[PDB]
Amino acid sequence: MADYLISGGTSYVPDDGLTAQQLFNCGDGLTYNDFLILPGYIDFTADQVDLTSALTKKITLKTPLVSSPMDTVTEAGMAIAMALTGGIGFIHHNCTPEFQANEVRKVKKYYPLASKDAKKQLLCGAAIGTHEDDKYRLDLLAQAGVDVVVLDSSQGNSIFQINMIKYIKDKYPNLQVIGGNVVTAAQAKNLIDAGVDALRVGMGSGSICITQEVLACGRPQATAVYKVSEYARRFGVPVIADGGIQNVGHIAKALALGASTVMMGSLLAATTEAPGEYFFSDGIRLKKYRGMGSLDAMIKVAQGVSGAVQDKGSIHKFVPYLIAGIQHSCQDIGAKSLTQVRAMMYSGELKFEKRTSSAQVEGGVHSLHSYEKRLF
Amino acid sequence: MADYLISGGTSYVPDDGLTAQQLFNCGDGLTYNDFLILPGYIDFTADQVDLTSALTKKITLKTPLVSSPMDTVTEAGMAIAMALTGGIGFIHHNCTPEFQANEVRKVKKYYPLASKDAKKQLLCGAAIGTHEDDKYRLDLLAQAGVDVVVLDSSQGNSIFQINMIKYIKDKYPNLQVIGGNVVTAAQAKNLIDAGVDALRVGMGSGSICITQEVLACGRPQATAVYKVSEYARRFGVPVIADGGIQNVGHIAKALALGASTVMMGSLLAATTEAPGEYFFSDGIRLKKYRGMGSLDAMIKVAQGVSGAVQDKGSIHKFVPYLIAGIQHSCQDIGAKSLTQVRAMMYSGELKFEKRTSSAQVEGGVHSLHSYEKRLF
Amino acid sequence: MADYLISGGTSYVPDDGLTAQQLFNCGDGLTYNDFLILPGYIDFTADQVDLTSALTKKITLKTPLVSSPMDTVTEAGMAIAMALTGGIGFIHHNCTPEFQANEVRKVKKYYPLASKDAKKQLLCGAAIGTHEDDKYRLDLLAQAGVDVVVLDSSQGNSIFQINMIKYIKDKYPNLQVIGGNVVTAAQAKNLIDAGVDALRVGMGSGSICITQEVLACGRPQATAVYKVSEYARRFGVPVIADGGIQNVGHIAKALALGASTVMMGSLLAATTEAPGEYFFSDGIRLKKYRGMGSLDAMIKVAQGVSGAVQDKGSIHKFVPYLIAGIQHSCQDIGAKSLTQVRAMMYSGELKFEKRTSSAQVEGGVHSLHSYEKRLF
Amino acid sequence: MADYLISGGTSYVPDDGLTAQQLFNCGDGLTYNDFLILPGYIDFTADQVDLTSALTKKITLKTPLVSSPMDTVTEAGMAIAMALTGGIGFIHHNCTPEFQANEVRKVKKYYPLASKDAKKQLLCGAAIGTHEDDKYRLDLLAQAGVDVVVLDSSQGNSIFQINMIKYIKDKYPNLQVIGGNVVTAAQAKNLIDAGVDALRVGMGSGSICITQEVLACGRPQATAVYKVSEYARRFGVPVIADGGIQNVGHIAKALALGASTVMMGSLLAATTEAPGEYFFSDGIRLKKYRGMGSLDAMIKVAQGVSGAVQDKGSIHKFVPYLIAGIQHSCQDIGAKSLTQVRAMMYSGELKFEKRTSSAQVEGGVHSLHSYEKRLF
């Protein structure tokens, strides 16, 4: 038995690759399509990967796909749509409080991926501001009975947001909050000590956000979702990644970096459950998609744009492709669960590699005349 | 009281980020849109940030927005316009000396942001050459009574410029000078020891300048405005950043690197207070904008181009947007003043992060079909 | 004889350059067009370079040019075509097993570059899947008498592939297998210990592959073909480089990094020996070229695209240009054989240099109006 | 006198910048438009800079501007044209030997920048091959009396070239040779020990050359012209920089890196003294420009392209702009001669800085609608 008593169970497993901390302490601000994940060993099929992920300290979901509360992406409609497929939705606060109240009543007065509560009503969350008049919003939201709320802000480290956190945690102890936006560990500490139940991480790296180009704030997305998640697991706090998502690759490598759920704003935009309706320009069927920092929210500054993106049909045909993509990525990484993927990442077993710009432009399609890219 | 006697007042504040000197001693020549500023903690509102900044050793301004003396951007017109909103203007020397004399008389013979002197006449500066015949310019400018002058040159380290500095500092002791252009600390020393009252830093990185591509001189702008400002505060000397400004983000992160005022050449071009008048090409209402190093200044070499840029209306609607942008950036950085921003930068409290090209191309708008970008 | 007794034979040979391990342990994921090979000393003509390379442990070839088994590039046709010029071909498994059986019979029932066996029948290989029903494929392939098989898979480190390797190495001892795809040394170990006779290295970096952009797996190609070949020569195992080949430069520097043969998928596509036939779009005579991970192979995910590329005529006029390109590159590197090129690489004598993006965009054609690029 | 006895003459001169060896031993393959030169101190006018540079060990020139021997750029015509303005020209060997003989007779049987010999005939050089039949070329060239010859080759380190060097240095001792192409110090040593009188450095980085993209050889240009010149001054050998020249900036920073003369192939192409004549495409008056490695020189490989570039008129109006550009760059660097520029470079006094891609794209013109770029 001498071949066992040298090391014990584990084979040699040569040291090719870079672990997470030697990748994100080189100082360079890497983003999603700037590194990539090296594979490992698989001993299991694609179908049996369990993507059960946690949203906050008491709310777990069957899929990590959550949506961002903008007025051009989610309502009660894609809320009930993602609640039917395991995710969660948040209702934007860019409306009257009574409209958000009857919106959050419409979803809870309403396929094995459950995401519904103890009394089999659907989990659904919402977004609330941080000004003093927003108390009159979320008290009516509690009468409607919302379960998790998002303290949506450009800067997550205000005196106003931590005062609001102290205002709900004494009044509403069962209710849970989502602090953000944070990008660094200092404001992550300054929210977690206030009693935040989960963070939403990432500012500036949105498909709409130009606040890096306008306010010079923020940081690259992947370094943020690594370092805030690395700090947040010290206290047992999940994080939520926003922005910089264009495909099923970015969300997979995003929650492989320590995130538990990922927040999809543009890639869930222009669906059949999205607000408004379709229109046409140059014969392309597309729906407008607009952030709050654009001046079309209602001496002001603008931190966002107004634009549009082509459609992708219903989510009920779209998010099974997303979970199949997460499912295949967590296959060929080599873990049977997302929890095992983060365990292999923080354990140093799962290894990465930095990627240069030429390997980026060869990572996609190249050296051909024309092509049709259909993902499913 | 044991929780106070371990450290004293200050909390933990984890070490996420890079301070300025570990960012600008890696050797890489970073520019403005190549790094970005990580946020901190705010405990104050947006309106009460005080952007009072110093121009030279006795001239302080209510806003750090100054303009560059080209013949296609400023006259007495945008001089009185920026004097009305706290800034300063300089009159280009590409004219006859009598024309610059009656120009600088028109501005001083002329809304709480003051920028006017002890006898309530407007602060206004001008630009003067460095050849021997320019003595007959600036002595008439002193009879007109200009307060600060800019020794405008491509290379700030001449024997001619320091001889000129010795020529005004014995004749005109109350008059103050602006040396430049410098990009490195050696010529910064060789001007400060001559008695320069403030520097203007940055060559080659202008929107017009091709002298990096033609004379192989200069350096990237952000490293220049960090290192010349880091040397210049040893002697209590402000610096002025030129070039590479396209937006309100670059000027904010520019004066966050140690600059006190920033010099806006192209982003203040094509206004209602700009010289000439508008014209049309392809139905776009645009005004020509041309530097001195172009051959259209009057065996010669050319260090600039002649071109045009689309308009932005009056500055009185435009620079309130700029000060609101500076105001929001200094908010979510976490300082109540620009002086506090530079104190947090040199103290190591304010931290930065390098940014890669993929995080640059995701920092702007991406992953959508079309958009309308309106900043205010 | 004192000039000999200081060192012995070898001259000074200054230390300009970087060897392979100091290039591929900096952590950066370099690819083919991101570094380049510094020249050495030549004492021989171009014609007498011997490009004899090994495919697996008993199969050697006269040229290292092998093709990839897709249904849009190779059949029996380009199999007999590359067997006539020293290479090898593999027949794609995306057909019925009887069709692959009569395909591999058509090639062996069939100009000094030989690549034919002991009984002067042509060497020709094929590709086989990894599912349980594929036993009924490769047993009929053995009745047809195929010599080397490729266990084609997206992830080379499955329990299924090593179980298949154990299933052929006890049944068919003379038959030889090609494991893959691997990119790292760990799965290279986990295939070599099973009894793999040669690897095929590189996933994601194909001209069709978007699985880096979709599944976030893989790594850059040149680092993979360096490190898997550096591990594989410990056990005397050749490797086969796939993907990222656009020209005769990439295959030359690819097999200079430790690869013995290189697998050409797109640059051998759209030939006269390619499947289907030509068609026209915009007046350009081009043939469709499609990978297996596209959904056009037959709730599914897609790891490839369907597209087309312009033609290059017959290979019998094309691969002499490729071997002449390899021949000239191995000339001005300074080795009389590919084996000597790998000996000079692992010995540290042959040296490399990293290349930046500006030197990349000047490495090609630049600073002119228009050009005609004809390679032969 | 205590202020003198601390250091002696020299002031403090702060350590901003990077010297040459800490820039070119970081391992990165920098090229011309990837770094730039920091300014110093000037105490002199633009007109009195002396750009006297050496070609080989006995041939000095009044300007460092030499041309490359291609059949689409130089003849006797631009030979007499550059001999009139201080430079040198070489006649391409892609013709019959009698045609090159009467070409080199036409130039010597023929404005203070002299470049003419002891008996006031014009200095003019030529290019000769390396095959055995080329002896019958250069012996007739010696009867015509050429002064310097270029052993033109893709790879400067052959047994054939050093045998040729031994063949002319015993026969023709007054005649001088130009070895090349070299990019590294090893082949620089292996030519200098043979008796080479000056090198020409740089392969692959030409405007025509695709041999980096085809043969995977070569290196970036600026690192080559630094390191080969750093080795070559150990033996007192000048080097000649080819390729990667688009402007007067690249040649200035090129000979600031240790080169004495620079070889201009494309930027001297399409002149009135260039071969063939003008033609029109899309209404642009342009002349074809083609390298030898293109297949249009006469089973072959191709290392070049055939193309065209727009015209620039006569050189007698063009190279005064080039020497004025060199003259202004050597002004604001801070040296009165090119020899002083190389003395300040190797002495560590002259300092550089690496430049990133964003500072590259801001180094040129940016942030405007349209522009007219006229250099003189």
Ligand SMILES: NC(=O)c1ccc[n+]([C@@H]2O[C@H](COP(=O)([O-])OP(=O)(O)OC[C@H]3O[C@@H](n4cnc5c(N)ncnc54)[C@H](O)[C@@H]3O)[C@@H](O)[C@H]2O)c1
């Ligand atoms: N990438 C991102 O995540 C991102 C980045 C920027 C903006 N945004 C979006 O922009 C929206 C608006 O952002 P915002 O926070 O700047 O707008 P806001 O109206 O919520 O706050 C405006 C400013 O007032 C301050 N503030 C907050 N509460 C206050 C109170 N009681 N009294 C006085 N001042 C108070 C804040 O500091 C803020 O700078 C957000 O809903 C967010 O979704 C998102």
Ligand SMILES: NC(=O)c1ccc[n+]([C@@H]2O[C@H](COP(=O)([O-])OP(=O)(O)OC[C@H]3O[C@@H](n4cnc5c(N)ncnc54)[C@H](O)[C@@H]3O)[C@@H](O)[C@H]2O)c1
């Ligand atoms: N990005 C920048 O800041 C930048 C860069 C380049 C040029 N420029 C613009 O280009 C304009 C002209 O630049 P310039 O200084 O090269 O033109 P200039 O006419 O002022 O000086 C021309 C040259 O003569 C020399 N000189 C100065 N005084 C002299 C004197 N008495 N006698 C003899 N020579 C003297 C200088 O060294 C200079 O190289 C400047 O006004 C500047 O605004 C700006």
Ligand SMILES: NC(=O)c1ccc[n+]([C@@H]2O[C@H](COP(=O)([O-])OP(=O)(O)OC[C@H]3O[C@@H](n4cnc5c(N)ncnc54)[C@H](O)[C@@H]3O)[C@@H](O)[C@H]2O)c1
């Ligand atoms: N750049 C590359 O080299 C590359 C990358 C990706 C895909 N591809 C191509 O895509 C093709 C298909 O790839 P694929 O392997 O994902 O498709 P597949 O049908 O061969 O395997 C599908 C999945 O089932 C699993 N599997 C294998 N054998 C199994 C078995 N008996 N039982 C249950 N599950 C089993 C595998 O893990 C795999 O994830 C391949 O032929 C390959 O050529 C190539």
Ligand SMILES: NC(=O)c1ccc[n+]([C@@H]2O[C@H](COP(=O)([O-])OP(=O)(O)OC[C@H]3O[C@@H](n4cnc5c(N)ncnc54)[C@H](O)[C@@H]3O)[C@@H](O)[C@H]2O)c1
């Ligand atoms: N950027 C550059 O500087 C560059 C790079 C590549 C090519 N080129 C141009 O391409 C031209 C041709 O280049 P080339 O040297 O490859 O063509 P060539 O005809 O001079 O040599 C062809 C090959 O034969 C070999 N050779 C030389 N002398 C020989 C001899 N007596 N006997 C047998 N073989 C011999 C050489 O090694 C060479 O690989 C050159 O004139 C050069 O100007 C320039």
Ligand SMILES: O=c1[nH]cnc2c1ncn2[C@@H]1O[C@H](COP(=O)(O)O)[C@@H](O)[C@H]1O
């Ligand atoms: O108006 C805005 N200005 C800046 N960022 C925004 C704005 N609106 C939404 N965002 C961010 O963009 C994210 C959406 O991600 P994306 O659309 O997929 O890039 C949200 O979760 C927010 O963090």
Ligand SMILES: O=c1[nH]cnc2c1ncn2[C@@H]1O[C@H](COP(=O)(O)O)[C@@H](O)[C@H]1O
């Ligand atoms: O003609 C020129 N050649 C080179 N630089 C110039 C010229 N004219 C102005 N500049 C510089 O460009 C700056 C203007 O900044 P910008 O236009 O906003 O890029 C000025 O402050 C000068 O430093």
Ligand SMILES: O=c1[nH]cnc2c1ncn2[C@@H]1O[C@H](COP(=O)(O)O)[C@@H](O)[C@H]1O
């Ligand atoms: O469908 C696919 N999805 C992903 N990779 C593929 C697919 N088909 C072929 N490949 C890979 O692409 C390689 C071909 O190289 P290339 O076409 O020259 O880039 C093959 O050897 C495979 O490794």
Ligand SMILES: O=c1[nH]cnc2c1ncn2[C@@H]1O[C@H](COP(=O)(O)O)[C@@H](O)[C@H]1O
């Ligand atoms: O045909 C060719 N193939 C590769 N390099 C060439 C060829 N012809 C000329 N060159 C190189 O290109 C240089 C000309 O520099 P450029 O045209 O200014 O880029 C010459 O000095 C040669 O070193």
